[PDB]
């Protein structure tokens, strides 16, 4: 299947409590493989997957330098954006950044991306052509003019559709024994009366990888769009994921409902009936 490499960065100002908190994480697909946390003891980029540990000391030094430069750049940007948005120095604010690339199953480049946020809202994003920016408001447009003048998109593009792809291919080879595994969901349904007259049906998907999945309830084949409770997909903590979906039904009518389970590891979509 296709694969992705993504880095996520969060910087949070803490006025009067020292320098901003800074957390960086790198993922291949849904598997974390490196982290940096400004409050951790080592002050180094650190491995989080077995197949990255073989990288040499020059790699860990370079990744540490480059994540610390990202941190220092965010620290400056926190102060700049506070000015653009006419905010005071007293409040805590947040910058989030995600970037990365996707490749196909034969390794070809598919897509590159970079998006930035301020206080949990869009700030600026690189467009899919990797040549243009889209600013979310008139403050962010100041950054866009700066980045246009600096020819930042061209530099970033050489990474997102070149360097990023080259490293992602190396990691997929480093990690082949585990990154090319897909685990299909193990599924079952449970039934819980909530009174003499109604019961909760809950459709369960467990042990699946990657995280992407769809659970939907039907009643006589009609999608029960509302009336369904659906939790966020969640990590088991062993590298796999879990999800459930529930519906409240009249006692005696359970067999009119079906749960439908779609996951890239399933050969056919699964239908469950109580």
């Amino acid at each position: 299947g296709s694969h992705s490499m993504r880095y996520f960065f969060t910087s949070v100002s803490r006025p009067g409590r020292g320098e901003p908190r800074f957390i960086a994480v790198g993922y291949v697909d849904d598997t974390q493989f490196v982290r940096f946390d400004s409050d951790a003891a080592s002050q180094r980029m650190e491995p989080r997957a077995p197949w990255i540990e073989q990288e040499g000391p020059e790699y860990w030094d370079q990744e540490t330098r480059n994540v610390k430069a990202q941190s220092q750049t965010d620290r400056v940007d926190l102060g700049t954006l506070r000015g653009y948005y006419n905010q005071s120095e007293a409040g805590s604010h947040t910058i989030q950044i995600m970037y990365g690339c996707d490749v196909g199953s034969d390794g070809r480049f598919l897509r590159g991306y970079r998006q930035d946020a301020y206080d949990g809202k869009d700030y600026i994003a690189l467009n899919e052509d990797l040549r243009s920016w889209t600013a979310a408001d008139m403050a962010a447009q100041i950054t866009k003019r700066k980045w246009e003048a600096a020819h930042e998109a061209e530099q970033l593009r050489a990474y997102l559709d070149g360097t990023c792809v080259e490293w992602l291919r190396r990691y997929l080879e480093n990690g082949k024994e585990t990154l090319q595994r897909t685990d299909p969901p193990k599924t079952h349904m449970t039934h819980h009366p909530i009174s003499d007259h109604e019961a909760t049906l809950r459709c369960w998907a467990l042990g699946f990888y990657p995280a992407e999945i769809t659970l939907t309830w039907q009643r006589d084949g009609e999608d029960q769009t509302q009336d369904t409770e659906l939790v966020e997909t969640r990590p088991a903590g062993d590298g796999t994921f879990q999800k459930w979906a529930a519906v409240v039904v009249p006692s005696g009518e359970e067999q009119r409902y079906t749960c439908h389970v779609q996951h890239e590891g399933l050969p056919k979509p699964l239908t469950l009936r109580w």
Partner: peptide
């Protein structure tokens, strides 16, 4: 691996 080089906003 991370991108290097940083244009401030």
């Amino acid at each position: 691996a991370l991108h290097g080089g940083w244009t401030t906003k």
